[PDB]
Design a protein around this motif. Structure first.
Motif, short mmCIF file in Angstrom:
data_model
loop_
_atom_site.label_atom_id
_atom_site.label_comp_id
_atom_site.label_asym_id
_atom_site.label_seq_id
_atom_site.Cartn_x
_atom_site.Cartn_y
_atom_site.Cartn_z
N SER A 7 0.87 -1.17 0.00
CA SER A 7 0.00 0.00 0.00
C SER A 7 0.92 1.24 0.00
N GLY A 8 1.93 1.21 -0.88
CA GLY A 8 2.99 2.20 -0.94
C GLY A 8 2.79 3.47 -1.74
N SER A 9 1.67 3.62 -2.48
CA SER A 9 1.44 4.86 -3.25
C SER A 9 0.62 5.89 -2.44
N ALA A 10 0.81 7.22 -2.72
CA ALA A 10 0.08 8.30 -2.04
C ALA A 10 -0.52 9.39 -3.01
N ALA A 98 -1.00 2.48 -12.46
CA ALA A 98 -1.02 2.30 -10.99
C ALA A 98 0.36 1.96 -10.44
N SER A 99 0.64 2.45 -9.22
CA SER A 99 1.92 2.19 -8.58
C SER A 99 1.68 1.81 -7.13
N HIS A 100 0.64 1.01 -6.87
CA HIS A 100 0.24 0.56 -5.52
C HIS A 100 1.36 -0.16 -4.81
N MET A 101 2.23 -0.85 -5.59
CA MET A 101 3.39 -1.54 -5.05
C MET A 101 4.48 -1.64 -6.12
N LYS A 102 5.71 -1.96 -5.68
CA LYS A 102 6.86 -2.14 -6.55
C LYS A 102 6.56 -3.14 -7.69
N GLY A 103 6.92 -2.74 -8.91
CA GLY A 103 6.76 -3.52 -10.14
C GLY A 103 5.43 -3.39 -10.86
N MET A 104 4.44 -2.65 -10.28
CA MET A 104 3.13 -2.55 -10.91
C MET A 104 3.13 -1.50 -12.02
N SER A 126 -4.06 -2.00 10.62
CA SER A 126 -3.72 -3.41 10.36
C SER A 126 -4.05 -4.30 11.57
N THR A 127 -4.72 -5.45 11.34
CA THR A 127 -5.13 -6.36 12.41
C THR A 127 -3.96 -7.19 12.93
N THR A 128 -2.89 -7.34 12.12
CA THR A 128 -1.72 -8.13 12.48
C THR A 128 -0.68 -7.29 13.21
N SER A 129 -0.37 -6.08 12.70
CA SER A 129 0.66 -5.21 13.30
C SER A 129 0.11 -4.08 14.18
N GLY A 130 -1.14 -3.66 13.98
CA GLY A 130 -1.70 -2.52 14.70
C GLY A 130 -1.27 -1.16 14.15
N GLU A 131 -0.55 -1.13 13.04
CA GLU A 131 -0.03 0.10 12.44
C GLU A 131 -1.05 0.70 11.48
N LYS A 132 -1.12 2.04 11.44
CA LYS A 132 -2.02 2.79 10.57
C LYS A 132 -1.55 2.77 9.10
N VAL A 133 -2.28 2.08 8.24
CA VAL A 133 -1.99 2.03 6.80
C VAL A 133 -2.78 3.19 6.19
N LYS A 134 -2.09 4.18 5.57
CA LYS A 134 -2.70 5.40 5.02
C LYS A 134 -3.20 5.33 3.58
#
Length: 147
Positions: A7-10, A98-104, A126-134
């Motif tokens: 989820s690397g694009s902004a 789209a550039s949602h992730m590397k190589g797309m 995220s339910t696994t890490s608890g970190e805010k995915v923007k």
């Protein structure tokens, strides 16, 4: 590390039509019901954008090699190179913007299916890490539940 990378694009694409009557208003809280990627299933999410467009399931080989991405949800009309407004059909070959992730970005994608729906950009915990995915791109209206 690989969670934020998927989820690397902004950047919001140009000419994207904001939804006139979305089921979930911008700023509303939702529950994600889909399993696109680990940490999303049943996650607490907030709507940051709602758009009326065509969402596509696509298959592509990343530009940096490695395994083919099979039946990926989702890329939209506005993220397909030179697509304009004409609806793409199953089996069509296209270039992804789209550039949602590397190589797309710039990959040759096959269109697996298409659907006119409301697509959402959401912040989620995220339910696994608890970190805010923007501003994660994307989830369709049918992949969200009212909080």
């Amino acid at each position: 590390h690989e969670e934020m990378d998927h989820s690397g694009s902004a950047d919001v694409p140009e000419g994207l039509q904001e939804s006139k009557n979305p089921k979930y208003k911008v700023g509303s809280q939702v529950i994600i019901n889909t399993s696109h990627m680990k940490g999303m299933k049943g996650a607490e999410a907030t709507v940051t954008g709602a758009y009326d467009t065509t969402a596509y399931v696509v298959s592509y080989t990343p530009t940096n090699g490695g395994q083919r991405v099979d039946h990926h949800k989702w890329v939209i009309q506005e993220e397909i190179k030179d697509a304009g407004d004409k609806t793409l059909q199953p089996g069509d070959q296209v270039i992804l913007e789209a550039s949602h992730m590397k190589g797309m970005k710039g990959a040759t994608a096959e269109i697996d299916s298409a659907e006119k729906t409301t697509v959402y950009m959401v912040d989620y915990t995220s339910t696994t890490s608890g970190e805010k995915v923007k501003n994660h791109k994307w989830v369709t209206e049918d992949e969200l539940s009212a909080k």
